[PDB]
């Protein structure tokens, strides 16, 4: 019935007009007067030389000393970043890994990829060896992202256009979120872990409620696939990185876009996005083999992190904000400061 | 300066490094092949002669092959096709009888053109297989090879038609100096397919070792 489609289109026009009426002044006008950040220079303090293939994911531990990296050579390695030592080396059953996570308590890690299975590993056991705790199956497409809520809950993002919330003890999908139209590529939990956002290949991002399992809001504006997403430290905003060489900042309360972070000479897509501790710096990894640092309040590039010989595939910032770790398609991780 | 526990941790790290190096050396001597196809074009039978991703392992003449079939990975192809960059060779299956059935050598031709000229597979050789010799040979005497290729002018014979299709498929590559294409008609079912794959892989390995040395 085309009447339903016409009603949907009318509702879309109504909501677009409603969010246009709320745009009084841009963020640029508000922050036209604050002093610029200046120039940010970071030197690679450490280099990790364990992997033998391309690195696809990494995640910082909550204690800001241990991090886990996943590469397509079939190994999970947990590094002690202060002294470069390797704490654990976990061999994976399937070597096509695309995602990785570290539990907030530090007891578990998660892994997944093209085999449509999320695997949970137990790090602290009496036998002294890392063992596979659970294997979560149920997605039809490849795992894109996974993030721990606690030691018993986890949210996973899959390429079959759906996101799900699991119960690790029982291994069953507690809730399924099904709103997207294309592959879901990214994921980000709120600081208070009551909401989360996902970026999909339909060039849209959605806001979900874990308790009720329904899409609160939908944000549009990108012109291509979305590869990365990350909440603002306040929790009232988030930033997305897409394939059209553009990063954008959205605000939940204003329900619309705020900034566009682009330059004329950048024509490559963004693979990873992250924020600093104070939320003033926005770090984004590109296909030009170097990360860029953006002034989030002024959309002016403040620095470049050029130390990699291949595409930067992952990026993360410690909880206390001391260091930035970037992994690339060459087998080296660089820790900046 | 290091304490006793720090020294023991460093020793553990070194032993982990040794194990990682050993597994890397062991894995570097295995040949990885990616299997592609338009549909039910003969992948099943070639797998027989030897969830998401499917792996197949077999050993021939003291050489270990791993064949990855990603037919069941139903999603956007460009979001994970770069995961297979660096494979030794690509195996392509084309149904030689699928011309009368409904212009189905045009989907195969488009897929071959897309995969051969892809950015990630500029230097990766492609092995081309043409399944279903007998069925196409039987069909060619009833259905002329003019439904798909009208410009073709020649006798309706198995050999000439097969050569015409082979020539049509081969020249679709733009970079003819950075990769080779090996063509075979896999219907003998007399272990000639495995031998041909082994020969092509050995030639590819030799032409790759003639580049690290600088000779090329």
């Amino acid at each position: 019935l085309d009447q339903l489609r016409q009603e949907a289109e009318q509702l879309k026009n109504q909501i677009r007009d409603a969010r246009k009426a709320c745009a009084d002044a841009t963020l640029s006008q508000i922050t036209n007067n604050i002093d610029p950040v200046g120039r940010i220079q970071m030197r690679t303090r450490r280099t990790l030389r364990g992997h033998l293939a391309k690195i696809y994911a990494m995640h910082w531990g909550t204690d800001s000393r241990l991090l886990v990296s996943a590469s397509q050579d079939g190994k999970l390695i947990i590094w002690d970043s202060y002294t470069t030592n390797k704490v654990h080396a976990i061999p994976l059953r399937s070597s096509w890994v695309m995602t990785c996570a570290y539990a907030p308590s530090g007891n578990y890690v998660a892994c997944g990829g093209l085999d449509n299975i999320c695997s949970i590993y137990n790090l602290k056991t009496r036998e002294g060896n890392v063992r596979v705790s659970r294997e979560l199956a149920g997605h039809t497409g490849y795992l894109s992202c996974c993030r721990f809520l606690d030691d018993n809950q986890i949210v996973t993002s899959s390429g079959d256009t759906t996101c799900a919330l699991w119960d690790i003890e029982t291994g069953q999908q507690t809730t399924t979120f099904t709103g997207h139209t294309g592959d879901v590529m990214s994921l980000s939990l709120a600081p208070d872990t009551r909401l989360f956002v996902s970026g999909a290949c339909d060039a849209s991002a959605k806001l979900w409620d874990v308790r009720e399992g329904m899409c609160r809001q939908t944000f549009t504006g990108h012109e291509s696939d979305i590869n990365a997403i990350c909440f603002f430290p306040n929790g009232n905003a988030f930033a997305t990185g897409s394939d059209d060489a553009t990063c954008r900042l959205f605000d939940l309360r204003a329900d619309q876009e705020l900034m566009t972070y682009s330059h004329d000479n950048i024509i490559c897509g963004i693979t990873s996005v992250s924020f600093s501790k104070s939320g003033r710096l926005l770090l984004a990894g590109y296909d030009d083999f170097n990360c860029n640092v953006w002034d989030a309040l002024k959309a002016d590039r403040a620095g470049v992190l050029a130390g990699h010989d291949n595409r930067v595939s992952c990026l993360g910032v410690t909880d206390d904000g001391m260091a930035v770790a970037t992994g690339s398609w060459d087998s080296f991780l660089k820790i900046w400061n | 300066t290091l304490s006793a526990e720090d020294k023991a941790a460093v020793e553990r790290s070194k032993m982990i490094d040794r194990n990682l190096r050993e597994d890397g050396e062991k894995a570097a001597r295995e040949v990885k092949l990616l299997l592609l196809g338009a549909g039910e074009s003969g992948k099943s039978t070639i797998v027989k002669q030897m969830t998401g991703i499917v792996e197949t392992h077999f050993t021939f003449k003291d050489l270990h092959f791993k064949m990855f079939d990603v037919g069941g990975q139903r999603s956007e192809r460009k979001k994970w096709i770069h995961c297979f960059e660096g494979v030794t060779a690509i195996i392509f299956c084309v149904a030689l009888s699928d011309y009368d059935l409904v212009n189905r050598m045009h989907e195969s031709m488009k897929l071959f053109d897309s995969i051969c000229n892809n950015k990630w597979f500029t230097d990766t050789s492609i092995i081309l297989f043409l399944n279903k010799k007998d069925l196409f040979e039987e069909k060619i005497k009833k259905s002329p090879l003019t439904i798909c290729y009208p410009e073709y002018a020649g006798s309706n014979t198995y050999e000439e038609a097969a050569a015409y299709i082979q020539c049509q498929f081969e020249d679709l590559n733009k970079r003819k100096d950075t990769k080779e294409i090996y063509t075979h008609f896999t219907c003998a079912t007399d272990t000639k397919n495995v031998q041909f794959v082994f020969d092509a892989v050995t030639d590819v390995i030799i032409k790759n070792n003639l580049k690290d040395c600088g000779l090329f």
Partner: single-chain antibody, 233 residues
């Protein structure tokens, strides 16, 4: 089921030879460095030998250097100690101890049951002044240990370990690195202190807590134990 069983002890004439075995089961033996700890019939604990994972590093106490030899057989999951030229001062019970070293690990966590052996007839000093103290159930007690050299290291770790030995039993780890509780230890036990001054606090003491408490240092070899503080009543 992480038990370690020792065997090979008995009566031997002085100047003889004897070997001891430690059959491990229930854990990844090849990943753990193993120790040998000795206890005289009515004295405190004393460290003897240590072999690392992969047999890369071996250490001996100055009292047994040149006479004892330690080795391991990873495929057979057994630990050996070859003893030669035995004296009357070697009569004691020998314990088998496991310990794994990485960031955040808990060394000396499991002790074997021990085997008895009788023979016919610069180092950091840890002091435990209070030999014994009467304790009534339901109350709180404090045990003090002291070090002649500062155990605090430049990286922030204070290498002090607390052990409890119940009557007729092998010692059990309580607190490692002066502040962290071992697995399975109730929250009543608490450890605190500064360089060269440490204290163990027990709150709401009850039964099964009577025994002798030892303090050990892991800053540098050879590892040295305290005299031992004993609780009763």
């Amino acid at each position: 089921d992480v038990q370690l069983v020792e065997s090979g002890g008995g009566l031997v004439q002085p100047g003889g030879s004897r070997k001891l075995s430690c059959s491990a089961s229930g854990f990844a033996f090849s990943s753990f460095g193993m120790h040998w700890v000795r206890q005289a019939p009515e004295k405190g604990l004393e460290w003897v030998a240590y072999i690392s994972s992969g047999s890369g590093t071996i250490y001996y106490a100055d009292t047994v250097k040149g006479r004892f030899t330690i080795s391991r057989d990873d495929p057979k999951n057994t630990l050996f100690l070859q003893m030669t030229s035995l004296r009357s001062e070697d009569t004691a019970m020998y314990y088998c101890v496991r310990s794994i070293y990485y960031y955040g690990s808990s060394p000396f966590d499991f002790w074997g049951q021990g085997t008895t052996l009788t023979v016919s007839s610069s180092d950091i000093v840890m002091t435990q002044a209070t030999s014994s103290v009467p304790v009534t159930p339901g109350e709180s007690v404090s045990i003090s240990c002291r070090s002649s050299k500062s155990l605090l290291h430049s990286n922030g770790n204070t290498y002090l370990y607390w052990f409890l030995q119940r009557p007729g039993q092998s010692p059990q780890l309580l607190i490692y690195r002066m502040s962290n509780l071992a697995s399975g230890v109730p929250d009543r036990f608490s450890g605190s202190g500064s360089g060269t001054a440490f204290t163990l606090t027990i709150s709401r003491l009850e039964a099964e807590d009577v025994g002798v408490y030892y303090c050990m240092q892991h800053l540098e070899y050879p590892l040295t134990f305290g005299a031992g503080t004993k609780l009763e009543l």
